[PDB]
Each structure stands twice: as C-alpha cells, then as structure tokens.
Design an enzyme around this catalytic site. Structure first.
Site, PDB file in Angstrom:
ATOM      1  N   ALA A  84       0.718  -1.273   0.000  1.00  0.00           N
ATOM      2  CA  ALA A  84       0.000   0.000   0.000  1.00  0.00           C
ATOM      3  C   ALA A  84       0.737   1.305   0.000  1.00  0.00           C
ATOM      4  O   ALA A  84       0.215   2.280  -0.514  1.00  0.00           O
ATOM      5  CB  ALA A  84      -1.009  -0.029   1.156  1.00  0.00           C
ATOM      6  N   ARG A 112       8.009   3.370   5.528  1.00  0.00           N
ATOM      7  CA  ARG A 112       6.960   3.661   4.555  1.00  0.00           C
ATOM      8  C   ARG A 112       5.591   3.590   5.198  1.00  0.00           C
ATOM      9  O   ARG A 112       4.668   4.277   4.740  1.00  0.00           O
ATOM     10  CB  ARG A 112       7.058   2.712   3.357  1.00  0.00           C
ATOM     11  N   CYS A 192       3.860   0.063 -12.229  1.00  0.00           N
ATOM     12  CA  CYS A 192       4.507   1.020 -13.131  1.00  0.00           C
ATOM     13  C   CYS A 192       5.775   0.378 -13.748  1.00  0.00           C
ATOM     14  O   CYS A 192       6.408   0.978 -14.633  1.00  0.00           O
ATOM     15  CB  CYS A 192       4.837   2.296 -12.371  1.00  0.00           C
TER      16      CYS A 192
END
Length: 254
Positions: A84, A112, A192
């Site tokens: 996430a 993170r 990505c």
C-alpha cells in the site's frame, strides 16, 4: 512528467477545489474523470499548499488513478491493498467507497508505513486499517482466521530484499492474493514496472498455476485522453508515454 491531481471528494467538490486553486494562479485542465485535473502551470510546488495539507487532493499520475477505478470497490466491500505505501491508491479506494466498508492496507517497511499513515490521515480516510507486516507471513494470520476479501489490489512498486519484496515477489504475491479472495472475488494487478517478468508474465503465471481463476477483460474505452491500449494478453492494459507507463490486469476467483 505530466502532473495531475486527484481531488479528494471525501472532503471537497472538484469544481470548488479547481476554482480555489485557479484563484491562486494554478492552471488546470480537465481529464476523463470529473475529479482529476492536469496541472498545466502553477506558481508554486503543488504539494506546498494549504489545500494539500488539508487533504483536498492527492498529486499523482493519472495512470496511477486507473487501478482503483478498474477494481471498482463497492461501499460495503472488504478490501485488501497488499503493497500500500505511499497510499495514493489506498486513499483513492477509500474515496470510491465514500469512506464506508474496510480497506486493509499492508506495508512491510516501518518507515513507509509512516508515509502511508500520513496520507491516510491527511486525506481524512476512516475506513482503512494499516498493517505493518510482510504479506508472505500476514497471509497465514488471515487464512487461519478465515479473513477473506471481496476485492484485492496488488499494485507493485517500480533484509533489503524484504523491503523491496513487492517489486520482486509479484508471482508469489498474486498467488497469495487469489488464496485470500472469496469465491467470485476480484483482484487487480498493476505496476509502473515494464520489466519482462513483471507484467503479462505474472498473469500468465497465475492462470497456468491455478484452476480457480480467470481473466476479466478490461476495456480501454473509458480512459479518454490517456495513451492506453492492450497488452499482449487480450483484456490487459498498458499505458504509454506521455502518461506514466503502467500495466493493469484484473482476475476473478471461480
């Protein structure tokens, strides 16, 4: 890189935010979403405004807005966001759910996890449970407690290896994802990364590995103004420059 913002409808109307920024000299162009705008010019850093502080928008590529839309969560769904951080997609899912239901957002890095929590709090997200854990271990806790999901987002970023595990263990993680789905549940895989074993080959891996999963055809048609078309597996999508490169696929447990 083109800069876009996603207006946070949990807190403000898109046209109201648009005008507020235009009054400060920001030039914003429409997109296929009534709540996303392309920033054409801005006299200041888009992330330095009180509007950003107040959680009125999330600066992120428009490609990155596609996985949550493709997943299409219901307000009453129980959802898992496997990798996430930083939380752009997690908060997008919460917006789509109007802050109802539950999103379990997992992040392996303690550092993170702080960024993830910051975004969730800044965006006014109330339906998300943040778990700082390794999915390879946490999945055993979910399974033993019979905690299954209606939908799952496995959006992979693009020991040190554990920290980067979601950029390396996509095949292992997509299989864990199908194990965690309720029958008829859906999983979206996105990334990505354009690496050769991280797009279509992850999907080919799971379709060959399991007899309880099938591909859901995603159509490029609604994504007007985005340079998007099919991958080499029919029904999967790839986004190309000038938009942020991205690969998206959707699966159903059967």
């Amino acid at each position: 890189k083109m800069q876009f913002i996603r207006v946070n409808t949990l807190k403000i109307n898109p046209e109201v935010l648009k005008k507020r920024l235009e009054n400060k000299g920001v030039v914003l162009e429409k997109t296929f979403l009534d709540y996303a705008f392309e920033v054409k010019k801005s006299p200041f850093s888009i992330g330095s405004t009180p509007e950003y502080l107040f959680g009125y928008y999330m600066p992120q590529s428009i490609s990155s807005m596609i996985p949550p839309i493709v997943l299409n969560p219901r307000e009453d769904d129980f959802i898992l966001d496997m990798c996430a951080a930083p939380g752009g997609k997690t908060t997008h899912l919460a917006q789509l759910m109007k802050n109802k239901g539950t999103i379990v957002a997992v992040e392996i890095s303690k550092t993170r996890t702080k960024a993830l929590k910051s975004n969730i709090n800044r965006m006014g997200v109330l339906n998300t449970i943040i778990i700082n854990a390794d999915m390879r271990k946490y999945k055993d806790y979910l399974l033993k407690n019979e905690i299954f999901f209606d939908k799952i987002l496995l959006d992979a970023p693009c020991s040190e290896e554990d920290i980067k595990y979601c950029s390396l263990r996509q095949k292992e993680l997509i299989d864990i994802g199908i194990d965690l789905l309720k029958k008829d549940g859906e999983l979206v895989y996105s990334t990505c990364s354009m690496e050769v074993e991280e797009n279509e080959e992850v999907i080919k891996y799971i379709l060959q590995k399991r007899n309880d999963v099938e591909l859901i055809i995603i159509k490029a048609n609604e994504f007007k103004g985005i340079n998007i078309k099919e991958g080499y597996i029919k029904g999967t999508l790839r986004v190309f420059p000038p938009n942020e490169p991205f690969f998206i696929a959707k699966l159903r447990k059967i």
